[PDB]
Design a protein around this motif. Sequence first.
Motif, PDB file in Angstrom:
ATOM      1  N   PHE A 207       0.813  -1.211   0.000  1.00  0.00           N
ATOM      2  CA  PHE A 207       0.000   0.000   0.000  1.00  0.00           C
ATOM      3  C   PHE A 207       0.849   1.265   0.000  1.00  0.00           C
ATOM      4  N   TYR A 208       2.086   1.183   0.495  1.00  0.00           N
ATOM      5  CA  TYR A 208       2.962   2.349   0.544  1.00  0.00           C
ATOM      6  C   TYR A 208       3.252   2.894  -0.850  1.00  0.00           C
ATOM      7  N   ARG A 209       3.453   2.010  -1.830  1.00  0.00           N
ATOM      8  CA  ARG A 209       3.743   2.476  -3.183  1.00  0.00           C
ATOM      9  C   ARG A 209       2.521   3.096  -3.847  1.00  0.00           C
ATOM     10  N   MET A 210       1.318   2.653  -3.477  1.00  0.00           N
ATOM     11  CA  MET A 210       0.109   3.237  -4.047  1.00  0.00           C
ATOM     12  C   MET A 210      -0.121   4.648  -3.518  1.00  0.00           C
ATOM     13  N   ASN A 211       0.017   4.837  -2.205  1.00  0.00           N
ATOM     14  CA  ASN A 211      -0.182   6.144  -1.576  1.00  0.00           C
ATOM     15  C   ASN A 211       0.815   6.264  -0.427  1.00  0.00           C
ATOM     16  N   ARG A 212       1.902   6.998  -0.664  1.00  0.00           N
ATOM     17  CA  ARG A 212       2.967   7.090   0.329  1.00  0.00           C
ATOM     18  C   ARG A 212       2.510   7.879   1.551  1.00  0.00           C
ATOM     19  N   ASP A 213       1.853   9.019   1.328  1.00  0.00           N
ATOM     20  CA  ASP A 213       1.452   9.870   2.443  1.00  0.00           C
ATOM     21  C   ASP A 213       0.400   9.183   3.306  1.00  0.00           C
ATOM     22  N   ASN A 214      -0.533   8.461   2.681  1.00  0.00           N
ATOM     23  CA  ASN A 214      -1.579   7.785   3.442  1.00  0.00           C
ATOM     24  C   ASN A 214      -0.989   6.739   4.381  1.00  0.00           C
ATOM     25  N   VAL A 215       0.000   5.978   3.907  1.00  0.00           N
ATOM     26  CA  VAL A 215       0.598   4.936   4.738  1.00  0.00           C
ATOM     27  C   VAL A 215       1.485   5.554   5.813  1.00  0.00           C
ATOM     28  N   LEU A 216       2.173   6.652   5.486  1.00  0.00           N
ATOM     29  CA  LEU A 216       2.920   7.384   6.504  1.00  0.00           C
ATOM     30  C   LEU A 216       1.993   7.884   7.606  1.00  0.00           C
TER      31      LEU A 216
END
Length: 447
Positions: free
Chosen positions: A419-428
């Motif tokens: 999921f980090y590669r799809m949306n970096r800020d969301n996973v952060l």
Amino acid sequence: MKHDLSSATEEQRYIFTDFIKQAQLALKGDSDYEVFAIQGFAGSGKTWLSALIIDELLELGMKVAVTSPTHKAVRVSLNMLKNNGIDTNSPLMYPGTIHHFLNLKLDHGFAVTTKAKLVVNKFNECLEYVDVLIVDEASMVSGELYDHALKTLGDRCKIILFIGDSYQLLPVDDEDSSIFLKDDIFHYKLTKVVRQAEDNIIIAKSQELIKAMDQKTYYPSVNDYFVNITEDTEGIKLLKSNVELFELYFSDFKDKMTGAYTNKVVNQFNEYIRYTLYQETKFICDKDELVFQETYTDSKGNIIVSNGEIIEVATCKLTTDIDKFKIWKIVSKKNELGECVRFNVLDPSSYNEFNDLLDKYLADAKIAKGYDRSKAWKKYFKLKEKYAKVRYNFSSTIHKLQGSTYQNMYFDMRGLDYFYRMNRDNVLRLVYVGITRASDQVFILQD
């Protein structure tokens, strides 16, 4: 002598002084804004500032509504205010849930909406009239709740103060309802790590995640943000396997909680921990703690249990309902209002029968004509929202953990890199909220 504003930061002193001035101006209809919001990350002294504001508002003689998402959050807030010397029994303070203050219930529009909407409850005359309305968790303020709160301006409150974190996690339906992206609200911002938290391992980690978030610069993997922690470091520990996790968890006697991103992993933690503790085959038992996955309403739509509420079962009986389904009749333990809540939960053995009937009700409703339409739609909704949707309280998704604090947190981070590669800020944001659920130790399991 009671509260020392000298040991507060420049921002805290400014926000306190400015909002108190705006609140006094609002008493004479001369405030520059009517809606305010305080932003602060973990360790920013946000909660202490809110208690300082509440205490001075009461000292000035103003009526203050202190609203929380659930009864559990109300009790937590009341204890926090008590920890700051605030007389929570003052006749000028009105603690309670945000749904209770706004006099809200659920309704589909029968007099038809696929999702019931929050509307004011008629026949209610015991309404609350205050000067200041405070909403302490911004993460749960949906667009419908926000619109209802603003509708009370000039009627039951004069200014509104929202409190939350700009690095929050919003639901999948309402990402644009963020109060912090609203331009008609005056935004107070706490951007400094206050003392007593400047030397917290978790807070220091959370600041690194925030640093990467506000400049849009990211590591190739979310796991790179924990290369220094390893299993040396205290505060935060990286575990190697599920075996080491549960070996530490079942030996842990501190106030703890486990969590993950996906519902399937969270469900696995809940079912495994519950059975390891009690070896219980019954869906509900005398020792369960149930967290509501959605608001529970009666047949008329009145809110019985708010979404996210955590209830301890006092009694539970497995019986049959409407000559069709196996259900659990539950009686909750007493809350702070002296009310024992009663609710029914569908047993998993009747899930297939229930879904088959709901599908038939739905099919019948959209073929119906004339006056049969509303009656058929009323029938579909009545069955659809008849039973409470609950889960156990040994694990939770990170989204539903906002506003809850524990000593230890067991954070399953496996799979997050996908999921980090799809949306970096969301996973952060996910990692930020996850590790900040613990004040003492965070146990992380990686890929």
